[PDB]
Design a protein around this ligand. Sequence first.
Ligand SMILES: CC(=O)N1CCN(c2ccccc2)CC1
Length: 123
Amino acid sequence: SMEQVAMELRLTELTRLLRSVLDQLQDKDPARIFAQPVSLKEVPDYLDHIKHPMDFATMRKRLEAQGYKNLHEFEEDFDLIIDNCMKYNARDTVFYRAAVRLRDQGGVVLRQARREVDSIGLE
Ligand SMILES: CC(=O)N1CCN(c2ccccc2)CC1
């Protein structure tokens, strides 16, 4: 149907926006601490601690499969990256502090993204 095509154009446009948002957020992780899944070879007990791991590469995979239907779903995954890190790692670690900085800086990008998604009506 034409409606289904219209919907898919919207989703494709959302994906384009979210890809821009994702690139901006990853730029706030210059140390690339959140670039890849935590290695279960390097941290064998990780899944005892963290029940829903997340990272930028996993997000990108979901993104390119157009698996984010709305900004909220994307934000949930970004929040998982930060929140998992701030639980597993203690306050006085380079890992925890990197998550705090990414959260604070990322907030700026997500604030405007929400306005853009609302404005261009992508949901
Ligand atoms: C995202 C996060 O929480 N990290 C980064 C990956 N980690 C790690 C530990 C040992 C060797 C290599 C990497 C654990 C802390």
